[PDB]
């Protein structure tokens with residue numbers, strides 16, 4: 001699989017001998033028989049490489065480390081092609097060449113923290129490369145341990161170049177046919193100062209061969225050539241890609257490092273220097289700090305720095321000064337990274353260095369910098385540098401960046417790119433949308449839905465909602481992928497803003513209910529709440545602007561979201577806060593009163609209902625006569641009042657029949673009328689269920705508690721009729737009909753839900769069930785204990801299971817409500833008599849169900865138990881229940897009010913489609929049963945949304961915190977200008993004298 005590797009690469013040997021010890025490092029005794037000044041290329045022999053393979057470090061590791069030995073005189077193009085194609089390494093978006101000596105086995109804690117936190121994280125984020133020394137020493141060791149720490153805390157392709165000869169255990173790497181299995185003794189016990197082990201954190205190794213036993217600086221030429229070639233290469237895909245930025249990071253160093261950085265600046269490579277690193281690196285930082293310092297008093301400052309910031313050797317020599325001057329001749333390329341007391345953030349510094357290194361008006365040269373800015377989450381640097389207006393951009397130049405920002409969840413970046421005159425409509429294509437949807441994160445819920453379902457999002461939406469403009473598509477994609485800021489921005493640019501917000505809330509809630517992550521669902525619910533709040537604010541502003549237009553058209557309309565009104569969307573989403581606002585409540589009241597004025601008094605309505613001619617007077621404010629009659633009798637409130645009156649009459653008839661007319665004889669006229677009335681009620685309930693996708697509407701109808709109560713009442717009535725008509729089940733029928741009448745009477749509580757001050761009371765009463773159950777359980781346990789103890793102590797002689805159960809449960813239960821049979825428990829209140837032959841003394845209670853006679857061995861204990869039971873039950877439990885009720889009532893007032901306001905719409909919709917006749921007469925009604933304006937309204941809504949967003953932005957900018965930020969920036973700019981003025985004044989004073 002590596003046949004061409006020995007052919008396209010070469011290895012260098014010592015060949016000639018140039019002295020007992022050569023400059024080549026190989027002794028004359030072990031020297032080729034072919035044996036002034038040694039020459040790297042003239043005194044060497046080229047041979048095929050015999051050290052390539054994949055290293056597998058013993059112990060922990062990835063079992064994959066491509067190692068290659070190549071001669072110094074090799075074109076970097078072949079090496080780069082080998083890495084990109086044969087080894088499968090992806091084209092890097094960035095190459096960072098960390099350089100320096102870093103004398104000392106350990107480095108500063110702040111420096112190591114900066115390395116690990118900035119460089120490795122940035123490389124992981126952008127998929128960069130880190131090219132360092134391929135040895136376990138100094139900066140190579142530091143970057144290796146930083147990469148290891150980052151890896152174990154989560155990959156990063158951190159390569160390494162090392163000279164051939166300074167590598168320990170080079171004997172095990174030789175296999176001409178391939179070293180794919182390779183064991184390396186990196187943990188070797190012997191230690192030496194000339195050969196170093198290879199780090200186990202590097203993905204690849206390039207062993208530069210120069211025909212020496214091992215030295216330093218022999219890989220510098222190949223390193224620089226590789227960096228320069230990579231700097232002039234595209235990110236794969238041939239010429240369709242963009243250039244690969246290359247940056248050099250220098251930490252400490254020596255004269256060799258100074259020559260390296262000078263050559264790199266000559267080769268037009270951006271460089272980055274860290275302040276505080278040490279010698280040979282802080283010298284450049286101090287020189288940049290001086291900047292255009294005057295020669296007078298600064299000419300000797302160079303020698304001063306060379307003597308204080310560098311070692312005494314070569315400090316007096318001016319060759320170092322010449323190198324410094326050559327470096328400063330091209331100071332534009334390189335920059336200095338201020339420590340800033342451990343900033344641990346240098347992505348902005350890298351972006352600034354890269355943007356200042358190019359210096360070209362063409363936008364093609366800044367594509368790599370824009371991609372790096374998009375990969376990171378900093379937008380101020382990109383806007384200030386790339387989008388300063390000097391660079392002329394284009395839609396096709398920004399399309400790839402927009403795609404990358406969308407895929408990588410960069411909301412500020414997509415906002416900025418769209419803001420810069422980008423045609424979104426022409427940008428979006430079906431293939432791009434398919435890519436966006438395929439960019440789902442791993443095995444997410446949306447990914448599962450896509451797999452179950454060419455995006456084919458219509459099927460997913462139909463299966464989620466029920467199935468009963470690029471901005472909309474982008475909003476749907478963001479909601480499906482759960483991107484909060486993306487969804488917010490897309491909604492801000494939408495057309496049907498209120499409907500979009502309500503549908504977004506519905507979709508987020510229904511997907512959170514379906515999401516098994518148990519943590520992403522919380523974020524979905526939070527985003528749904530945010531969208532609901534935005535919709536509430538927007539609709540409130542629209543209603544305050546024009547009540548009629550908003551209330552009429554904006555809600556009662558069918559958009560393209562689901563072909564359902566906004567009220568229906570809110571009801572499905574259970575957006576209680578949407579119904580809580582005053583505009584929605586006013587619209588609901590207007591619909592509830594129909595064609596009648598919402599200010600019509602209740603007594604006037606009752607008088608009109610009981611006096612039909614009264615509707616043709618000034619009492620009620622709204623052919624003409626028939627129209628008025630149908631308007632009055634079709635209003636939902638009148639339907640509700642008629643239904644209430646009919647239900648009261650039905651209950652009265654039921655009570656009359658059950659109490660008087662219910663006889664074992666065949667049913668009379670009134671009983672038949674009651675049967676017909678119940679049949680009509682059943683027909684009405686069936687109509688409600690069937691017309692409330694048969695299964696979906698049926699289960700929606702069954703979801704209401706009142707509908708369940710009606711169904712169970714009708715079932716009980718049917719069972720009662722069946723038992724009554726049975727020849728031998730009259731009593732059972734009567735009993736079950738009594739229970740059914742109780743259920744029908746309990747059904748009457750639905751009336752109070754209409755009243756504004758009573759519905760929340762009903763909701764709170766419904767919520768009191770937890771406290772009720774707790775009290776019931778505690779009371780049941782205490783009753784069981786006390787009853788069993790008292791029954792055991794008394795020892796009544798009845799000993800009958802029904803009587804035992806009575807004396808254990810029923811009597812102590814009645815003792816709670818003041819029914820205390822003292823004469824049945826206290827022996828002192830009952831006469832003594834002989835009843836049983838059992839030993840002891842017995843007394844005869846006067847009660848009928850208290851037993852024939854009870855024991856009187858320890859009756860003071862019975863009295864004490866009675867006292868304790870009375871205390872506990874009648875005081876402690878009752879007061880605890882009262883306290884719990886008070887606490888619950890105080891706690892859930894607002895939630896109950898919101899729930900009532902939400903269900904008010906459901907009630908109004910239920911009574912909007914009910915037949916206009918009463919249930920007794922509903923049989924005949926059942927038998928009879930069986931553009932420019934839209935665009936103007938949307939423009940008005942969009943204008944109001946824009947005004948709301950502008951007002952919110954103005955409020956945010958006018959806040960105290962933002963004002964403090966702005967004044968701090970102003971003070972900083974003033975200080976900078978004052979420093980410039982001080983320098984100018986000093987220069988002018990120097991020149992004048």
Ligand SMILES: [Ca+2]
Nearest residue numbers: 358365366368
């Ligand atoms: Ca560039």
Ligand SMILES: [Ca+2]
Nearest residue numbers: 688706707710
């Ligand atoms: Ca019903």
